[PDB]
Structure 1
Amino acid sequence: RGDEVRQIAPGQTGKIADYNYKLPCDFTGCVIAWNSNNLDSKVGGNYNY
């Protein structure tokens, strides 16, 4: 979700950070995120994710 992009960072909390995808704080690397509404969203709800 768009609101959860802030959770993809070292030392974060939330459902994504805690239960799905966790980053170290000794993390060297780059986080990239971009909107994909035109691709991953369809009428009636895309429930594949």
Structure 2
Amino acid sequence: KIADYNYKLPDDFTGCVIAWNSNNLDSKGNYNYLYRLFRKSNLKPFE
């Protein structure tokens, strides 16, 4: 779901991914933060 509908990377992606745990800065039940779950096609890079 995430790799195709929320954030699409080029298959030749020369880069780094950094993850910061923020349970103390983002958690509430925080509803303002969502994710894309369904889409008919795959995203383009930088879309």
The reply to whether TM is greater than 0.5 is yes
Q: Show structure 1 runs of 5+ residues with no match.
A: 1-14
What count of residue pairs does the alignment treat as equivalent?
33
Q: Cα RMSD between the aligned structures?
A: 0.9
Structure 1 stretches of 4+ moved >4 Å? none
Structure having greater relative contact order (Cα 8 Å, sep ≥ 6): 2
2-side partners of 1:40 and 1:17: how far apart?
Answer: 22
The structure where helix makes up a greater share of residues is 1
User: How many percent identity over aligned positions?
Assistant: 97
Extract unaligned runs of 5+ from structure 2: 34-47
Pair 1:19 & 2:13 matched? no
TM-score, normalisation: structure 1: 0.59
